[PDB]
């Protein structure tokens, strides 16, 4: 799954993905996605 | 005399009153913007603001001495000067209503001089008298440091960090729930942090949960030989078709499947299957009732249950009514608080600087949010004057007529009698 | 609240005033913080010792500040905060709530689980197997329930053990939570509101109660507020009013007290009914007092006989 | 399934395919 806050960012950069409507740790950050 | 002091934290000029790091000036500004996003919090602090913007303000002589001509003329000066400002009185209130979101609202007063077109801050009237213009204004994210005063007692001065450090008597500050006399006071959002944080995360888990509910998803199991690049063209064609089947299968009229089926003599199990993925459990906690509990708790903190429950037949928003709602009375406390800041602030500054130096001052008042229930008022007077008690007075005949929405009647022109049959 | 007096002295002083009479007064603190008082100084036999410091030193005398105690019974300066008899339900509620939040967070039922043979996982594994594991990682991290949701998984029932080696399934739990946390938390919240007798917060305004002290249907919480107001009044009277009355000279036996109005006006209709049904028969005698009390119940001030209402502008 | 946008667009170029009513993403797209 997603544990390492690190692997998530690396996987957050891959252009070939799907724009999820919402993921964990979204509503506590101002600059949303 | 002053044997004590209001030492709250005195860390580095910044007020370290709140032991929670997140809810402190450098970060509390960050948090309050986040908390305003939730509709439950946003609507709670928006109904309060609507009430303030709804009431009107009128300058009047003090509790007594309403008959004095000198005082009555002073009110006419102040009422006209209130509308003389380049931003209407209502607009000032709207800027003040940053009150709820942060707990305080500084407003550096700017004084226009001798009334008379001229320039600088142009203004109507030419009685060469002092007046107000421009800021107010101000935002809470600019104030960095609050200057103290020796023993920390009575130090109402702060900067605006380029920097524009302002002195104590140059601005109005409004305190929401001033308890220890700290400049920041206490925003109403402070006692709603815990429900909000719980509500938001559990909501966020629900949305992710719906997105990751893969029950019923089509799963195709193929032998490893089929999946690959060196597989025979026939096998590779089969895999390609399964890709379109996965990508395009719906529940239309012509829905169906013709799949190969081969029960292997060994292991007595089939090799190909088209099956819908199934889960063998249920989610532990009911997220639906969980969120509902927190929403009521948030509204309970702001005492805005009228948003959910709705207007009742035994509750009212009228201050003068005998059944004032809990929320409606809260705006009264806020409304009175502004009137209290009026003591040292602009009017006193306007009065003192212009000289005069009179013992009695002129005070500002507010009207009711909504008109009181006329039917109770009507039943009251009509059934209690015929017995006595009430002594009929101009004040009675004016308030009763103003409740409908009229103005004190002119005795010069009465209603006719020729028609009245 | 340490009383800090003041003298007008024609303004031009440390504490400016506006009434030029050269009389003593009050300014500044009050104020003061509860977390600063370190030690309370006693007086021999412990009888009537209301003195404490504010940590040369900053010790304050007994008669310089006012003490507002909540439920003083044993003469303890700290009194008894209402939170004391609500500590336990609060702790229970906070605990259960944290457990509930943690439980919701770790509700891993339905998460995708992929079963691969051990040889796939590793570094010396064939490059194709590494690509397989990478694609499985992408599936795990990206798979959602959109409209083209689906799966093409390799599968092979091994001749021995009669079980598949590649295993894709949703993790499933075979039990249910023992206790229903929601009802428990609601019960504890109800107990908490009961402790402060603030049921009107949740239940709402009931037709069997009101917030008017002068009414006959005063709510329990309103009565508690009345007790608090009476305590404040008595403390103010025996304290600073007396000090000002004595120190400023004059020295008159009879003192002036402070009074407070009602939180909300009583039921206007009921008052009207009472007056109508008791005065038209006699009983209550009409005087100036009723005529001002009812009129201020409306919200006005005693009628000015100087300006009565016209007769022309009428029937 | 829908785990690759580039794959998603490539499969949308196929003319001989059924047209679904609602698709993922058709809630925040200006031009549908």
Numbering used by the authors:
A (entry chain C): 101 to 133
B (entry chain B): 17 to 177, 195 to 454
C (entry chain A): 123 to 177, 195 to 454
D (entry chain D): 101 to 132
What does the literature reporting this entry say, word for word?
Bacteriophage Sf14 infects the human pathogen Shigella flexneri. Here, we report multiple high-resolution structures of the full Sf14 particle, including symmetric and asymmetric reconstructions of the virion capsid, empty capsid, portal region, tail, and baseplate. Sf14 virions have a spherical icosahedral capsid of 820 Å in diameter, which is connected to a long, contractile tail that is approximately 1205 Å long and an average of 235 Å in diameter, expanding to 315 Å at the baseplate. Overall, phage Sf14 appears to share some similarities to other model phages, but in different combinations: both λ- and T4-like decoration proteins, HK97-like capsid and portal proteins, T4/Mu-like tail fibers, a Mu-like baseplate, and a P2-like tail needle.
We determined the structure of the Sf14 neck or portal region next, with the map resolved to 3.4 Å resolution. In addition to the portal protein gp29, two sets of whiskers are seen between the capsid and tail. One set of whiskers points “up” toward the capsid, while the other set points “down” towards the tail. Each set of whiskers is made of four protein chains: two of gp30 and two of gp31, though one chain of gp30 threads through both up and down whiskers. The connecting copy of gp30 may be involved in maintaining the up/down conformation, though how this would occur is unclear. Each whisker is attached to the neck by adapter protein gp37, which binds to a gp30 dimer. This is then bound to a dimer of gp31, completing the whisker. A key component of the neck is the dodecameric portal complex. The Sf14 portal is structurally most similar to that of HK97 and Agrobacterium phage Milano.
